[PDB]
Design a protein around this ligand. Structure first.
Ligand SMILES: Nc1ncnc2c1ncn2[C@@H]1O[C@H](COP(=O)(O)OP(N)(=O)O)[C@@H](O)[C@H]1O
Ligand SMILES: Nc1ncnc2c1ncn2[C@@H]1O[C@H](COP(=O)(O)OP(N)(=O)O)[C@@H](O)[C@H]1O
Ligand SMILES: Nc1ncnc2c1ncn2[C@@H]1O[C@H](COP(=O)(O)OP(N)(=O)O)[C@@H](O)[C@H]1O
Ligand SMILES: Nc1ncnc2c1ncn2[C@@H]1O[C@H](COP(=O)(O)OP(N)(=O)O)[C@@H](O)[C@H]1O
Ligand SMILES: [Mg+2]
Ligand SMILES: [Mg+2]
Ligand SMILES: [Mg+2]
Ligand SMILES: [Mg+2]
Lengths: 183, 186, 182, 182
């Protein structure tokens, strides 16, 4: 049931916050992203935290080829992530690479917030970023990531230790994937 | 009257803010400063003496408390008691209750404070929901003489659910029950 | 008025560009008055000067002028080693409000220099909005934990970054209702 | 049986009291079997020895016997510099479960020795209750973050305290359902 996947992964996300586990994960590396993905989809996907080995094609979207995935992710790891502009760059490339069979979008948005929090003492205020504008920026980010960088730059918050802001980002993050959730 | 309902509901709101903003773990563990950090935030817009040591003598209800003349220095002595072991930790809790450094709010603020010591030093907190009001207040009074009862009642009701927000709420509910206030939700 | 505004801003840039800032005493009222003297030198007759009349109006409860010089020495004696100590001193220093004008902007440069030396960070003021800041400052009279949370969440290690210093200037002035460019 | 349990405990204290423990290789299967060999000396014919049958206990998912020696070299090759790396190695070692019996107890002494050398801590196992430990070990096959949190929260720098070493023995044996004394 989808309702398992939703209710349980949301519970796991709250546990990451309440147990202070988010800050234990490596910053801005594929390792840190799979630590998030692994805990998120713990008893849900058998590939939790695991790189895919088949190719996936959504549509008009070229992702990293399965044959070169592990090496490509190492290249992404070594991109810099000190400035905002670098951080969205790395996010844009990790999304293009799409290392997981499923759960890339939700897990990467948690991962992005942690880079911003550690490096710029901000997180994304996803609640003010509507679904249509966000998904469009993400699609266009395969050519030009200017629109995405602006949309995110216009919606930062300094409430980086605020559990209710974290909840609000979970709500909107799942909305981006067509799941309407509560608390 | 109604300003009592303000006291209660706003202090409970402040307690949930300490969790939800991750302020609890920012406060100093097991010292009077840490206790007064909790008291001050709990009673922020409620008590004009929030976080402040009293300057007149309680010594109320037939019980002997620290005299105001020597209060600040006595609190320093309590600060240097060790709190590594369960036995030490309850000793510190007992001696600080005896000192009773605030005009009001000692009971609720010290139980949050006890939990933080236990969390940091033993990865547990008190499961106050299973410690009844009668047994707790009796052990507290008796701890003036002998704190064996208090140590036992607490040891028998520890929980490792130290990152569980709902357990935290259950401990707010019971802590205010001990002081004669029936609150809900939070 | 907008001349005097702009001239204090130009003095703030001279303090960075001439490397005068690292000359000043750290975390004392003398250091603060050094900043306040240079900031407002041909703007306020009292630049760098302790005030001799009580502040303005309202239900504002800043230090009494007659005891100001002595209370400032007690403020000077507070420690400024930890983050918690540094904000404690900032909070008490703002309560005493030692100048006739220029307390907010001068004290913010001052607090940045304390944090820079003691902890190799400054406040990235551009990320702290005016409403939350002034609320935290007013509430620090009753309890300063929120102020400490607001500032700590907003620290930056870009302590030699000239553009951070500029952005801090512009926001610092907005806190006081001053629109400033470049 | 109760003689065997008690004999292995006697062996564990000999390892401490004779300072044999620090003789053993750190963080390798070789070091582990050194522990397991001395531990179960007159107790298991296979003491210190890789098993040759699969542990077809239930639907437990350990390393197949046929590939056990090679996968053990792969485990050996994992790093054990950081806490995160060290639990990762413990998790993969427990998954391979290289002994017919005695995996849990021998591996806990072995893990304490890694942590002691690399981080100057050991696990204060007495504060880790049995229910939470076994769930974390079982779940570490899917995600080992909870296990890492449990263990990290219970590190102690009392690395030469023989009374801590004794309490870890008592708790380690309870994890396997043996009620031992002193
Ligand atoms: N067509 C597309 N081109 C580029 N990026 C795309 C895309 N369709 C989706 N995405 C990105 O991938 C994410 C969803 O990937 P998916 O693996 O399903 O994650 P999920 N829905 O399981 O959380 C979106 O949030 C978006 O960032
Ligand atoms: N007679 C007494 N002797 C010793 N301790 C006593 C006592 N009466 C109450 N206490 C303790 O002090 C706490 C009350 O704190 P207090 O400042 O007087 O009340 P409150 N409701 O403002 O929190 C109780 O929770 C109890 O633990
Ligand atoms: N009511 C108040 N209580 C305490 N502090 C207050 C306050 N209103 C303002 N403040 C603080 O004082 C500063 C204003 O000081 P002021 O003397 O006007 O300096 P200025 N505007 O010339 O830079 C503000 O930045 C704020 O931090
Ligand atoms: N189902 C399981 N999956 C993974 N690990 C498991 C498990 N059941 C038990 N374990 C682990 O293996 C240990 C038991 O191994 P065993 O070979 O029986 O050792 P022992 N010392 O009891 O004689 C436990 O302490 C636990 O860490
Ligand atoms: Mg999916
Ligand atoms: Mg009351
Ligand atoms: Mg002016
Ligand atoms: Mg045996």
């Amino acid at each position: 049931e989808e309702e398992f996947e939703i209710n349980l992964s949301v519970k796991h996300l709250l546990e990451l916050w309440d147990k202070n586990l988010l800050n234990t994960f490596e910053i801005g590396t594929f390792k840190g992203l799979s630590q998030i993905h692994s805990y998120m989809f713990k008893d849900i996907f058998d590939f939790n935290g695991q790189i895919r080995n088949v190719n996936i094609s959504k549509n008009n979207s070229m992702f990293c080829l399965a044959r070169y995935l592990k090496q490509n992710l190492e290249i992404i790891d070594n991109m810099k992530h000190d400035t905002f502009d670098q951080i969205i760059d790395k996010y844009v490339e990790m999304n293009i690479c799409h290392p997981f069979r499923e759960g890339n979008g939700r897990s990467m948005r948690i991962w992005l917030d942690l880079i911003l929090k550690k490096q710029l003492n901000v997180v994304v205020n996803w609640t003010n970023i509507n679904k249509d504008e966000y998904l469009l920026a993400m699609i266009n980010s395969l050519i030009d990531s200017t629109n995405l960088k602006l949309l995110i730059k216009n919606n930062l918050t300094n409430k980086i230790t605020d559990r209710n802001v974290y909840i609000k980002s979970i709500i909107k993050s799942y909305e981006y994937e067509g799941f309407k959730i509560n608390i």
